[PDB]
Amino acid sequence: STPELRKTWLDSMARIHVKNGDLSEAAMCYVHVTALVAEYLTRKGVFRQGCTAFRVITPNIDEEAHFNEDVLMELLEQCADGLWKAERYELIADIYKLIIPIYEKRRDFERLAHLYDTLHRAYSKVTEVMHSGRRLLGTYFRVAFFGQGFFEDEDGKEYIYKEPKLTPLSEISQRLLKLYSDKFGSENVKMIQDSGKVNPKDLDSKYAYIQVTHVIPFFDEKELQERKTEFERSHNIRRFMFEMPFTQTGKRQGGVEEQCKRRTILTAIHCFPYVKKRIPVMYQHHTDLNPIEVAIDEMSKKVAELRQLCSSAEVDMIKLQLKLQGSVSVAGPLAYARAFLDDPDNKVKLLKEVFRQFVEACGQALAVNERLIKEDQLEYQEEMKANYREMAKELSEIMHEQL
Amino acid sequence: STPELRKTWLDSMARIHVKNGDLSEAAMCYVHVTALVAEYLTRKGVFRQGCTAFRVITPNIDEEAHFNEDVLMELLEQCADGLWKAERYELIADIYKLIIPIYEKRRDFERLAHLYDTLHRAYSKVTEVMHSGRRLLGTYFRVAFFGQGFFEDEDGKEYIYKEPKLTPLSEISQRLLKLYSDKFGSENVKMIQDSGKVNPKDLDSKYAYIQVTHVIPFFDEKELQERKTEFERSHNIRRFMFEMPFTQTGKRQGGVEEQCKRRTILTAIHCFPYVKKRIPVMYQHHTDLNPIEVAIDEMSKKVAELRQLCSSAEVDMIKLQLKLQGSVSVAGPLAYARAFLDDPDNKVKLLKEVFRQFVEACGQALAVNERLIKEDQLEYQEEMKANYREMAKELSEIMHEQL
Amino acid sequence: HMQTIKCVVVGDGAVGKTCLLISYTTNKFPSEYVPTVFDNYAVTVMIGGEPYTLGLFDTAGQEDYDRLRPLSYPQTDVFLVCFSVVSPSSFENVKEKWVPEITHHCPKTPFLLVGTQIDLRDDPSTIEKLAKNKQKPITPETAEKLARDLKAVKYVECSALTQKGLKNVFDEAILAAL
Amino acid sequence: HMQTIKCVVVGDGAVGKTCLLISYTTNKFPSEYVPTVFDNYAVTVMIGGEPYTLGLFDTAGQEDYDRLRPLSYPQTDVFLVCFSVVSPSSFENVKEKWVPEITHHCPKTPFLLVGTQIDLRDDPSTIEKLAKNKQKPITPETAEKLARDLKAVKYVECSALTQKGLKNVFDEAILAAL
Ligand SMILES: Nc1nc2c(ncn2[C@@H]2O[C@H](COP(=O)(O)OP(=O)(O)OP(=O)(O)O)[C@@H](O)[C@H]2O)c(=O)[nH]1
Ligand SMILES: Nc1nc2c(ncn2[C@@H]2O[C@H](COP(=O)(O)OP(=O)(O)OP(=O)(O)O)[C@@H](O)[C@H]2O)c(=O)[nH]1
Ligand SMILES: [Mg+2]
Ligand SMILES: [Mg+2]
């Protein structure tokens, strides 16, 4: 029986995920099983919706191309608690909406009381973590294997790996090394500690090669408009991205006048979270940026960073000073102005405008900070005020305008 | 502007109801206003549903044959809190379901948290009052006015009045008298303290006559199957009923062999609760019962009463003894057996069968009680055991069988 | 769950014990009663904003039941000792038979004095029967005296026929039993 | 809201202060760095099941900034005093210049001793340069000695190039600052 075997595998995946503490993957296994039973029951005229009712919880549900209402209800309650344990609170309501009419028809008021209790706690949690930042749904990595000799069919395959909370590159690296050192023996596993696109045409067939690269979710402007919250940018994600330095001529790093940046976007065959913690890369492309585009890019990140720190009602003083001091008390940003704003390409209007917002935000942060210190500083603040004012001068000079 | 004037009147009714503590009527005024705005907005393509979305909260919504989403949302929140204040908890979800998708689209997580908090408390309240019996939604009365002289157009009109909690007939009577004694002057108002169908053909045109009759919600077998809980039998009710004694020959009361019962069913033009605390009677009919049918009727009420008291896990000892003592230690039930079960009409099978369940329940209650007393009784229990056993004898005799 | 209060009603035959029990619990006036073969009544009552279940134990007023009547006396939370305000012998029996009998079985159980058939204070024929014997309907004041002398929580009065006083009587009974 | 910890990094020029800051916060290896014109870094870290925001203040190791460097010293919750395990002069400067300078401004602020470039303990050419001067890469043990003599919470070591030890270093820094 196909569906029951599917349910069998999914249920066992879930036990594995729970044991491993990979709760969102366990959660996805429940959702997938629930969707399957829902689809079946919908075809028999027992249940109302089916597959697509869960499509908003995960688009991977598509893949789900004895069972009764009571089993369904129990599975729905399992999805809800699994989603709670995974800390994906925003999603619990999509599950509970499907069982609410059943409890009402059954007059099961205590079950209704309980699910509404969970929903209340869910949304309370949502506003809490949206403020505090304490929810950590995971970090992402491009992992690529090289070496027919020891990987065999695994050679030449790239995956996106989803790791716990704030897993650093080193941590997944050794868990991977140690895993294939037990598999293949220590002396035979090598980590390619670099993210450049490698041609197998210069590896040594004597060794197993693993390449690990930190990547972050990638979104286009439209997606950024549709995905309004940090959660919505952390759920149902299929695309990831990293940047590497290059110059047209020689080394990868160089002078600001020669520094280029290649941005690579990778698409997985499924979205995360999924019923597995790794997913094959389906496709990829890249976009190269010019030295001035690099400049604009990095300048815009800083202004936004300073703005956001200032715009805060709950200002973090240390983080403000960190970013502020690293902005005025360093060359520095001036190096851009010098190479890109003195007597090319008339897109230059943008650089100037970012710089303007830059001086303003620095100014605003200087202001904010003057009101934050306990005199044990003041001299520090004054120096930063000094430095700041000095650089404004040079900008105003080169740009032949105020600042 | 019709809808806005409707909304105007409804809003002012509601203020009146709130001032009067008639919270369900206030609640119905909110629901009615919300339904009107919903219908309007649904026609403009602003809102999804309309009128019929509230039809399950009240079928009176039909009658509802500047405004924007924000007004609607505020009105929905008003319905929810009004329904809370009226203690009609079961109904809050039908309102909140209509605003939940709006809050989700708006990412309003704090509003979501709050409404789920209310729903949780709602259903907790539901299971509490379903057990304790402490929720008192109201008492019902047929009120009929007679006297062109002082009532004018009000003469000959019958209403159903809905009163607070456990209002006794006397309380509504004087509130009515006192109301028309201030209106018309003391010496000119008379209460018809009797429920017989009066022909104006024997009243005195010198006086204002008010007739008040306690009635209870009436349901047919199908309705009793559909309305499974005490709440569902207390909400959206249109039909009410009372009984009067009569004999074919003379007085209204007589020997069990001659005692008949007329059961009158009254239908109001609207269901309760409504936007007013009284509603015109639309139609009525009656059904007469024979002396033996009366007997069967009263016997069946007692068995069910004794059963329910026994079937309790949380047995009320005093109430058990009250009903039990009034069953065996009184003539009494025997009077029926004598007149209806000794050597007519072969429906008689039913009487015998109720009597059988009667002796059993009495027996069961005797049992239950033996386990409840603190010896300060025991002699009481013994007498009831005596009496019980004695009557079983006579029944067993007349019925020529065991008991 | 709701508390259940035991109220036992005693007094001379024909003062109107059963009528005020039926009228209170059913809202019916005497003329509208559907004859019943069972005894005792249970009604929910609202006191101080809270509901109570009131258990009403009826009793026979005749001497023929002096033996059985007190069986129902244990566990009583309050007593109603009734007399007809137009029956002087009813009144006297309160002091002579009724409170004595209830104090004897239930030493510290509270009781109200309840006067019945107050509607007959205005009845011409009743007034006249009483005059011919040099008597008048008991007044609220002479009843209040009796109440404190005998130490009842208080005196309340009513008519089952007009239902005046009816609600107040059972309210006070619950208050007294608390 | 998340607590923010001030970590200031000091040590001789070229021991690798900036590299381990960039590598830790970006996960990048040195070869993959995209040159930046700004200083300092903020990373969230998980300690004892709770998240913390770690503020990393970089400093110049050259004498030319002796005057400005200590400006960033007030409010510091912890210091990292760095030296290259393959630079003996780096080591000595810990005792001669670095801890003295930080104890002078921040008397009771904790500090770890951080050894850098441990990957160069195995480099043939480095080993050889050191031999020609009769020297060997500082060992963990001789570093541990220095740590307690100078009274640092402890000694930790790492390589920005291979990222070995990197995670542990900043974990200990947070533990120490708490
Ligand atoms: N006028 C008038 N008559 C009443 C009133 N209450 C009762 N009666 C009449 O008085 C008679 C006695 O009424 P019951 O209630 O049977 O008196 P009782 O005290 O229960 O008698 P026992 O059960 O034998 O002890 C009946 O005919 C009643 O209809 C009243 O309030 N006013
Ligand atoms: N082999 C090796 N080289 C490193 C390591 N860390 C840094 N380097 C190299 O050492 C040189 C100095 O690195 P920096 O991070 O700039 O040193 P610094 O202490 O910040 O220098 P100042 O900012 O001037 O005080 C650079 O060429 C680095 O690439 C390491 O862990 N291993
Ligand atoms: Mg009687
Ligand atoms: Mg540096």
Contacts with B335 (C-beta within 8 Å, 6 or more apart), sequence order: B256, C37
Q: In this structure, which residue's CA is closest to atom 2 in ligand 1? A: C117
**Residue count (chain C):** 178
**Alpha carbons C157 and C160: distance in angstroms, whole number:** 10
User: From residue A69, how far is each of A42, A44, A50, A73, B62 by CA, in Å?
Assistant: 10, 11, 12, 6, 35
* CA atoms of C129 and B6, how far apart (whole Å): 64
Residues of C with CB under 8 A from a CB of B: 1-2, 4-6, 24, 26-29, 31-42, 44-46, 50-51, 53, 55-58, 68, 71-72, 74-75, 162-164, 166-167
Cβ neighbors of B21 (< 8 A, separation 6 or more) are: B164
Contacts 24+ apart (CB under 8 A), D29-34: D29/A193, D29/A194, D29/D160, D29/D161, D29/D163, D30/D160, D30/D161, D31/A194, D31/A252, D32/A194, D32/A195, D32/A196, D32/A244, D32/A245, D32/A252, D33/A245, D33/A253, D34/A243, D34/A244, D34/A245, D34/A253, D34/A259, D34/A261, D34/A294
Q: How many CB atoms are located within 10 Å of the residue A125 CB? A: 18
CA angle A5, A29, A234 (to 5 degrees): 155
CA C158 and chain centroid, separation:
9
Total domain count, chain D: 1
A residues 292..321 contacting D (CB < 8 A) = 294, 298, 302, 314, 316, 318-319
DSSP, residue by residue, B159-207: EEEEESTT--HHHHHHHHHHHHHHHH-GGGEEEE---S---GGGS-TTS
> Does ligand 1 have an atom closer than 6 angstroms to the CB of C157?
no
Query: Are D78 and D111 contacting, i.e. CB atoms less than 8 angstroms apart?
Result: yes
Q: Which two tokens stand for residue B224?
A: 């009793």
CA proximity to B244, closest of B274, B213, B222: B213
**CATH at residue D11:** 3.40.50.300
For the record, the structure tokens of B129 come out as 């009052």
Residue B176's alpha-carbon distances to A292, C160, C167, in angstroms, are 89, 19, 16
Query: Beta-strand (E) ranges in C12-97?
Result: 41-47, 50-57, 78-84
Q: Alpha helices of chain C — where are they, by DSSP H?
A: 17-26, 88-93, 99-105, 124-131, 140-150, 166-177
Alpha-carbon distance of D119 to C174, in angstroms, equals: 90
The answer to whether residue A396 neighbours chain B at the CB level (below 8 Å) is: no
Contacts of A73 (CB under 8 A, 6+ apart): A99, A102
Residue B140: what are its φ and ψ, rounded to 5°? -120, 145
Q: How far apart are CA B281 and CA B268, in angstroms?
A: 4
Backbone phi, then psi, for A72, in 5-degree steps?
Answer: -55, -45
D14 lines ligand 2 (CB under 6 A): yes
Ligand 4 midpoint to CA D58 (Å): 8
Q: Give CA–CA dist B351/B360, Å, rounded.
A: 14
Beta strands at C155-157 and C111-116: parallel, antiparallel or unpaired: parallel
- Say how far apart CA B29 and CA B75 lie, in whole Å: 11
The structure was resolved to a resolution in Å of: 2.2
Query: C20-48 burial, b if ≥16 CB within 10 A, otherwise e?
Result: bbbbbbbbbbbebbbbebbbbbbbebbbe
Question: One-letter amino acid identity for C100?
Answer: P
Cβ neighbours of residue A59 closer than 8 Å, sequence gap 6 or more: A236, A271
Cβ(A169)–Cβ(A192) under 8 Å?
no
DSSP E strands, A133-236: 139-146, 158-163, 189-192, 208-217
Picking from B250, B256, B361, B342, the residue whose alpha carbon sits closest to that of residue B298 is B256
Render the burial of D93-115: b for 16+ CB within 10 Å, e for the rest.
bbeebbbebbeeebeebbbbbbb
What's the count of helices (H) and strands (E) in chain B, helices before strands? 13, 7
Helices A349-370 and A379-398, axial angle in degrees (round to 10):
160
Question: Which strand (E) or helix (H) includes residue B106?
Answer: none
**DSSP class of A141:** E
Chain A residues 254-293 with a CB less than 8 Å from chain D: 254, 256, 259, 261
Q: CA-CA distance, D36 to D30, in Å (whole number)?
A: 13
Instruction: Give me the residues paired with residue B174 across strands.
Output: none
Determine the Cα–Cα distance for residues C135 and A207; give it in Å rounded to an integer.
126
| Helices and strands in chain D: count of H runs, count of E runs | 6, 6
Please name the member of C31, C35, C74 whose beta carbon is closest to the beta carbon of B380.
Answer: C74
Report the C-alpha gap between B34 and B292 in whole angstroms: 52
Contacts of B336 in chain C (CB under 8 A): 37
Q: Whose CA is closest to D8, among D87, D106, D96?
A: D106
Let me know if A269 is exposed, middle or buried by CB neighbors in 10 A (0-12, 13-18, 19+).
middle
How far apart are the C-alpha atoms of C172 and C153, rounded to whole Å?
9
What six digits make up the tokens of A194?
Answer: 């670099």
Per DSSP bridges, beta strands D155-157 and D50-57 are unpaired
Q: Are D14 and D61 in contact (CB under 8 A)?
A: yes
Quickly tell me which residue has 């907005």 as its tokens. B41
Instruction: Check: CB of residue A85 under 8 Å from CB of residue A27.
Output: yes
Measured over the CA atoms of residue C31, residue C34, residue C40 and residue C42, the dihedral's sign is negative
User: Do residue B120 and residue A120 have CB atoms under 8 angstroms apart?
Assistant: yes
Q: Is A349 exposed, middle or buried (0-12, 13-18, 19+ CB in 10 A)?
A: exposed
The tokens of B143 are what? 């009120």
Domain that holds residue C116: 1-178
Q: Is ligand 2 within 6 A of the CB of residue D30?
A: yes
Structure-determination approach: X-ray
C100 contact partners, CB below 8 Å, separation of at least 6: none
**Pairing, β B139-146 against β A189-192:** unpaired
Determine whether the annotation assigns residue C61 to a binding site. yes
Determine contact, residues A61/A35, Cβ cutoff 8 Å: yes
Complete domains list, chain B, with CATH: 1-134 (1.25.40.410), 136-289 (no CATH), 290-402 (1.20.58.740)
Strands (E), A187-309: 189-192, 208-217, 237-246, 260-272, 278-289
- Ligand 2 and D161: CB distance under 6 A: yes
User: Does chain C touch chain A (at least 3 C-beta pairs within 8 Å)?
Assistant: no
- Alpha carbon of residue C114 to chain centroid: 5
Task: Tokens for C102, please give them.
Answer: 């209830």
Which amino acid is it at B27? A
Long-range contacts of B147-153 (CB under 8 A, 24+ apart): B147/B203, B147/B205, B147/B207, B147/B208, B147/B209, B148/B205, B149/B205, B149/B206, B149/B207, B149/B208, B150/B180, B150/B183, B150/B184, B150/B188, B150/B189, B150/B207, B150/B208, B151/B208
Instruction: Judge contact between D55 and D39, C-beta under 8 A.
Output: no
- Residues before each break in chain A (C–N > 2.5 Å)? 65, 330, 343
Place of tokens 């974990």: D171
Query: Which amino acid is it at C157?
Result: E
- Under DSSP, the state recorded for C80 is E
- Alpha-carbon distance values, A386 to A379, A390, A392 (Å): 10, 6, 10
